[PDB]
Symmetry: C2
Subunit: 234 residues, 2 copies
């Protein structure tokens, strides 16, 4: 119902969700910490798919308030917390940490490295991190993402990474500003946090995605993707 409807309302969201659940795998019985949980609706789908416990964290008070009200209305058992994730103490030892659109909101590599250490401090030794973030290789000169609902307005060298302002296709227009840290700096953060295993995951563009759009539609998505998945394990 709701999760399908929202996931299909944007061509790229369907690819995002499919890629994140590919990385996650079977979540039956697992404890999950969703570190940039928004209003909780991804966490509610993880719960629906069989997770034993789902805890969501976000920076925004007013959004966590709204997340808790949604769980009361649905009767689901999700637990929420407001935290500045880069500086939070552990909430528990989870089988899975999910971090969609967390790491690109680290506004310095110092904060990026802190976030990865927070993830490790929240994971069982046989747990894993599944993340969705900006592909380090995206370059605005190679193509904007407006076909896919994100009008990237600029690209500013920002210390060792780049900062981007973007317009989303919302009514009214809305602004998001995010960071594109390098693959080197991600992998350094990963290793220094104690993840001896990682893999980058290309978004799973599939045959049906291509059939429902005109010729050339996904070219920039493939040649200059803005997004990437990432899986890390101790």
């Amino acid at each position: 119902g709701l999760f399908e409807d929202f996931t299909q309302s944007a061509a790229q969201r369907a690819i995002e969700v499919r890629t994140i659940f590919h990385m996650i795998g079977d979540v039956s019985g697992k404890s999950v910490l969703d570190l940039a949980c928004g209003f909780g609706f991804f966490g509610r789908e993880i719960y629906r798919r069989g997770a034993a416990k789902v805890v969501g964290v976000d920076i925004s008070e007013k959004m966590i308030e709204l997340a808790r009200e949604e769980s009361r209305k649905y009767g689901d058992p999700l637990e929420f917390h407001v935290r500045d994730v880069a500086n939070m103490e552990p909430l528990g030892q989870f089988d899975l940490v999910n971090a969609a659109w967390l790491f690109n909101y680290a506004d310095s590599v110092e904060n990026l490295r802190k976030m990865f250490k927070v993830v490790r401090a929240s994971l069982k030794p046989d747990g894993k991190l599944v993340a969705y973030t900006v592909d380090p290789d995206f370059s605005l000169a190679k193509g904007n993402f407006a076909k896919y609902g994100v009008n990237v307005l600029n690209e500013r060298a920002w210390g060792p990474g780049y900062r981007h302002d973007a317009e989303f296709v919302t009514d009214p227009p809305s602004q998001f500003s995010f960071y594109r840290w390098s693959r080197a700096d991600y992998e350094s953060a990963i290793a220094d946090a104690g993840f001896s295993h990682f893999e980058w995951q290309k978004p799973l563009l599939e045959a049906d995605d291509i059939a429902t759009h005109p010729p050339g539609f996904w070219d920039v998505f493939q040649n200059n993707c803005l997004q990437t998945g990432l899986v890390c394990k101790p």
Copy 2:
């Protein structure tokens, strides 16, 4: 190129744009004030379609500064201003005022009434207002707008109208809050601002929209539409 791509990136945005240009008509040679201009990109399309002069206003100086930078990079002649529209002084006498997602951000009927008077004070006697706002008849219980990228979370009585919190389908999730004022409150605002003519305009859902989504996709859009157009003339 960019306008087409971005407009088609969300099914509802295509219907909105079609409906707004239907209300506007031929803009050749006209002066246009876009009273909730975002980053200026609708204004840039109105300019491309032949407007003589396009001026944008919105509430966020961060957005307006980004709008100005986009005009410098594209070389277009758009001019922008940060204003609280309900309290602004006139910027000139225009042929057209466009107001997409302005009036549903008035947090009181007093502010709604003030906005309409500001529109009149900005219009030549033979000009017109084209607007896009929340349909007074929307009811959350009759269907959420999540298929169309807008998860309306709640509905509460708010003076003589209703207030809604909503989640947009963006990466990450984004929040915003808007107001659903009654048809009678709008019509009294229109008439007391000195508009002796108005018409409400249904969003133009067309055969090709219906054919390119699954069966039933547009049911809630047609039976419980969140959006309406509005045209007013002195």
